[PDB]
Amino acid sequence: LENPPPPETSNPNKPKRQTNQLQYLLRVVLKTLWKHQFAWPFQQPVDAVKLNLPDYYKIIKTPMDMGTIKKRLENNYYWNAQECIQDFNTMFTNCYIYNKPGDDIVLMAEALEKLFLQKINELPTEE
């Protein structure tokens, strides 16, 4: 099995805006998770070909990763903050579905998700 193409990250047919909350999601939330010790398996799509994990995209039909989220934020792909928060949540739940509770990758994702939730509780005031 091939890898799937990565999720779309640019679309000029989508209106674009800058907002307080989107700027925070890139400059604070994504930046804080990205520089964490455990970010690295989540910084790009799961490369099922390289990892010899041919079952990965047989089960995970909404893949998501922080590389994709970073590029979506940089390309103004999201209009609403919740569209970006949904993508972080998808990344975490994908990990929790594929991998057994307590597995190394799950403990890494849980350490990132704790920090994510703290930063989402500090989202700035909407326009």
Ligand X SMILES: CCS(=O)(=O)Nc1cc(-c2cc(NC3CCNCC3)c(=O)n(C)c2)cc2c1ccn2C(C)(c1ccccn1)c1ccccn1
Note the residues at the interface with ligand X (CB under 6 A). Answer: 41-44, 46-47, 50-51, 53, 95, 98-99, 104-105
In angstroms, what is the minimal distance from the CB of 33 to ligand X? 13
Nearer to ligand X, 42 or 78 (CB): 42
Of 6-14, 16-24, 48-56, 103-111, the segment contacting Na ion by CB under 5 A is: 6-14
Q: Which does 44 bind (CB under 5 to 8 A by kind): ligand X, Na ion, none?
A: ligand X
Place of tokens 């700035």: 124
Query: In whole angstroms, what is the distance from residue 85 CA to residue 63 CA?
Result: 14
**How many helices (H) and strands (E) would you count in the chain?**
7, 0
Nearest to 39 by CA among 8, 70, 62: 70
Query: In whole angstroms, what is the distance from residue 119 CA to residue 99 CA?
Result: 25
Nearer to Na ion, 14 or 58 (CB): 14
Residues 7/64, Cβ–Cβ less than 8 Å = yes
Q: Which does 46 bind (CB under 5 to 8 A by kind): ligand X, Na ion, none?
A: ligand X
Which two tokens mark 25?
């999601």
Write down how long the chain is. 127
Nearer to ligand X, 20 or 43 (CB): 43
Nearer to ligand X, 19 or 99 (CB): 99
